[PDB]
């Protein structure tokens, strides 16, 4: 009830302000001046050159509003899913709650690759923990 | 929670002490040449405890799709009998009935084997014992012990109930009832109700339940 | 070096996941105490003999962890009878739940019950059942039931017999 009613006002306004940056023209200059600051040196490879550039500010804020909507819409997401599977009058004894877990899990793996992409530091990440997620993923 | 201060308390301990190390091996500048023999042995430290959380969660993924125990049925793994309450990364908790919290790591469910009472019908069947002397008829006991099985409104009947004779006890004839019931809950009560019933059927028909015989040969 | 960093990432995850914690009772592989210390490579467990057990940390991830006190620290005890054959199967039922139902640390939510589950081979078996809130209360709630049941077993002639056996004398 209040938790759904305060997601669905949280979803449009997060509408009404991308809305409203995509058209007040203003915003636009706002998001280049937030993509002109410097935070950390980061590298990498891009279109097969070794580029080496710094962290703008606006990436720190992207990765901020990744990392609290992936926190807020964690949490949002069982009680949004057990309304639409309720009136679907189940199908097996607990596979409303595997379906809700399953995309929580899907949606906090999501949530992290952003985080990290908007970080950067994920490029390079490949070369120590990747043989771990391989050994994991190959036991299994 | 109840040890969270603790726990937090213990991180920034050990990121402290991590941080520091990091420093001091900088400022001493080894630890540019460090990466060569220690590196290998931090790289499988870590393998082995990331393998152990990923194994746990490809366990727990297909526990949640193929889905072989589930939240509400009675299960048993290695004599630790109780109803699944959740099902997380590697720990699923069994609410035992004693309200003793089992914590079965996730890879335990897949590779053991699991006894799930639960599953199709939530059917089950018990059986009663039953000890009779020697000097007695096996047809008024049979009658009396069928008795209650069919005047108990908790006792199924497409599996009817039967009542067998299958041991020549030392004492006691031993006569062997089973029965069947829907509900995993009317288990312990009706096994209570039938006890009841047959002892008072026992001292009604007059057919004697016998202690432990043996006979003496004295001489003095 | 990868038997310590193996033990560092254990605590790591009891730290973070916490099946365990400080203050509640556990038992692991019949070893039944409540745990002090979390730390590495090595958790303490206070047994009730006073005596220290240090469980490994993979331990408590890897085994199965009986945790007492995880969600409302409740628990349940049994408590034995035996009765004659020569006796009724009522007074007893009466006399029994008269102790549970008038004792004031026995709970009503899961309202105690008695049952006659056994022919024994000399006496009937009743079990009776109640349920207690604090971890702490368990010994003295059987003591004080069993003196009170063996007060009312005096007071309103049930016997409670011992094992017997029929003999066949010829001299």
């Not at chain 1, 964690?74 to 379906?99: D, F, H, K, T």
């Not at chain 2, 939240?71 to 997380?88: A, Y």
Request: with cysteine; hydrophobic share 50%.
């Amino acid at each position: 009830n209040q938790q759904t009613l305060r997601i669905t006002m949280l979803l449009m306004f997060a509408l009404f302000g991308v809305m409203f940056w995509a058209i007040w023209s203003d915003l636009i200059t706002v998001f280049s001046y937030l993509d002109s600051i410097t935070l950390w040196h980061y590298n990498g490879t891009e279109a097969g050159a070794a580029v080496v550039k710094n962290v703008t500010m606006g990436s720190l804020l992207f990765a901020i509003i990744a990392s609290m909507v992936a926190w807020a819409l964690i949490r949002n997401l069982p009680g949004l899913l057990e309304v639409l599977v309720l009136s679907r009058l189940n199908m097996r004894q607990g596979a409303s709650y595997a379906i809700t877990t399953i995309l929580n899990y899907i949606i906090i793996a999501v949530g992290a690759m952003t985080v990290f992409g908007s970080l950067g530091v994920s490029w390079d990440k490949l070369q120590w923990l990747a043989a771990a997620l391989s050994v994991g993923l190959s036991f299994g | 929670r109840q040890g969270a201060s603790y726990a937090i308390t213990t991180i920034l301990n050990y990121i402290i002490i991590a941080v520091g190390a990091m420093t001091v091996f900088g400022s001493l500048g080894v630890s540019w040449d460090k990466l060569q023999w220690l590196a290998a042995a931090l790289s499988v430290g870590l393998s082995f405890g990331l393998q152990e959380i990923f194994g746990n969660f490809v366990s727990g993924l297909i526990i949640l799709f193929e889905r072989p125990v589930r939240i509400g049925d009675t299960v048993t793994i290695g004599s630790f009998s109780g109803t699944v309450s959740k099902i997380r990364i590697r720990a699923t908790t069994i609410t035992d009935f004693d309200r003793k919290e089992v914590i079965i790591p996730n890879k335990a469910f897949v590779t053991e084997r699991l006894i799930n009472w639960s599953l199709t019908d939530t059917t089950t069947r018990l059986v009663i014992r039953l000890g009779v002397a020697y000097g007695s008829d096996l047809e008024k006991v049979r009658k009396v012990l069928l008795k209650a099985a069919t005047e108990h409104p908790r006792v199924m009947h497409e599996p009817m109930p039967e009542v067998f004779f299958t041991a020549f006890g030392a004492s006691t004839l031993d006569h062997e009832l089973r029965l069947y019931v829907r509900e995993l809950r009317d288990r312990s009560r009706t096994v209570d109700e039938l006890n009841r019933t047959i002892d008072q059927l026992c001292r009604e028909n007059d057919i004697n339940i016998a202690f432990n015989q043996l006979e003496v040969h004295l001489h003095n």
